[PDB]
Structure formats: C-alpha cells, structure tokens
C-alpha cells in the first residue's frame, strides 16, 4: 500500500487521484488518506504529488510510521474522492511546514 503523510494536511493539492487505476484514495476536510486493501502498489501516485507526501509503506520516514495506521483508519470513515479538485486556498503557504498533523480534521 502507498501512504499519504504529513505535508498533504493542508495542501490536499488532489493531483493524486488522477492517476489511481482503482480509485482508493478517500477525502477529508484538509487530507486526503489511500485505502490499504485496495491500493495495488501501481506507485503512479506518488510523483504526482506536488506536496510529495505520497511514500510506500515500507519507506514511509521512522517519524512518519504513525500516518501508515492513519490511513487505514480513516479510509474506513471517509467517502471516496474520484475527481481532482483545486488545492487548498492557501497550499503553498502550508506546503513544506512540518507536523501539521495537529492541524487534522476529522
Ligand atoms: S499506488 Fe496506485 S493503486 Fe495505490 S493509491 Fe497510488 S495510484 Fe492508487
Ligand atoms: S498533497 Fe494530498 S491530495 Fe494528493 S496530490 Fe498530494 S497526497
């Protein structure tokens, strides 16, 4: 499975899901999270993430291994996101900033 990580919170440039073949990726307010179970490891997400916070399970940073659970997680409660839409207001200002994980919404 590909996991998204800390600098997609508040960025959610959504360029991501463009390229997904089996649509896994699911929306939150301010994040975007990809299904474990249906991810089949295409890796085409992850160059096109502006934020490049889109990593491989097994390289996702030792201060980011929380992010891999939280994908899983929240996949499960929020709705599916097929379409890319336009980032964030204020995505670059955000984009880079670390440990915006205290910025999560539910
Ligand atoms: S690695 Fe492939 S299947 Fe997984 S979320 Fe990315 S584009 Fe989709
Ligand atoms: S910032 Fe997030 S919405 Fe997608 S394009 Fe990158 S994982």
Redo the contacts with the bound molecule.
Sequence with gaps: ??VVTDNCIKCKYTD?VE???????YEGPNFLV??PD?????????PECPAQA?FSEDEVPEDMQEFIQLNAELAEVWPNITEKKDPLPDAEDWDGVKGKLQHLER
């Excluded at 390229?19 to 990726?25: Q, Y």
């Excluded at 249906?38 to 992850?46: G, I, R, S, T, V």
């Design positions: 499975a590909f991501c390229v997904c073949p089996v649509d896994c990726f990809i299904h249906e991810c089949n490891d295409c890796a085409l997400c992850e889109i």
